[PDB]
Amino acid sequence: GSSGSSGEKTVVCKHWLRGLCKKGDQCEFLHEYDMTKMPECYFYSKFGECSNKECPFLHIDPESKIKDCPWSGPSSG
Ligand SMILES: [Zn+2]
Ligand SMILES: [Zn+2]
Numbered sequence: 001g002s003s004g005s006s007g008e009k010t011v012v013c014k015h016w017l018r019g020l021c022k023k024g025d026q027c028e029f030l031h032e033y034d035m036t037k038m039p040e041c042y043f044y045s046k047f048g049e050c051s052n053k054e055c056p057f058l059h060i061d062p063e064s065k066i067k068d069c070p071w072s073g074p075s076s077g
Contacts, residue, residue: 012038 013029015021021031030037041057044050048062064071 010037 009028009030011029012034013021013027013031016027016031021027024031035058039057041050041055041059044057044059050059063069064076
């Protein structure tokens with residue numbers, strides 16, 4: 001039924017980024033800047049509108065996050 005997860009380090013620590021973490025390898029999140037591991041643009045992910053040309057966040061269209069559509073897990077490129 002449930003295929004979730006406690007919450008791996010998939011996400012990059014938000015404290016370490018601004019140098020506000022003293023855990024390092026002990027932290028519960030990733031301390032490496034990855035365009036994949038890091039989360040998407042809360043704005044483009046929520047509002048779906050970001051006028052940023054150099055946004056350090058991921059910009060995904062709200063038209064590629066639908067099940068029905070042919071853009072699914074594998075089906076999608
Ligand atoms: Zn941390
Ligand atoms: Zn953005």
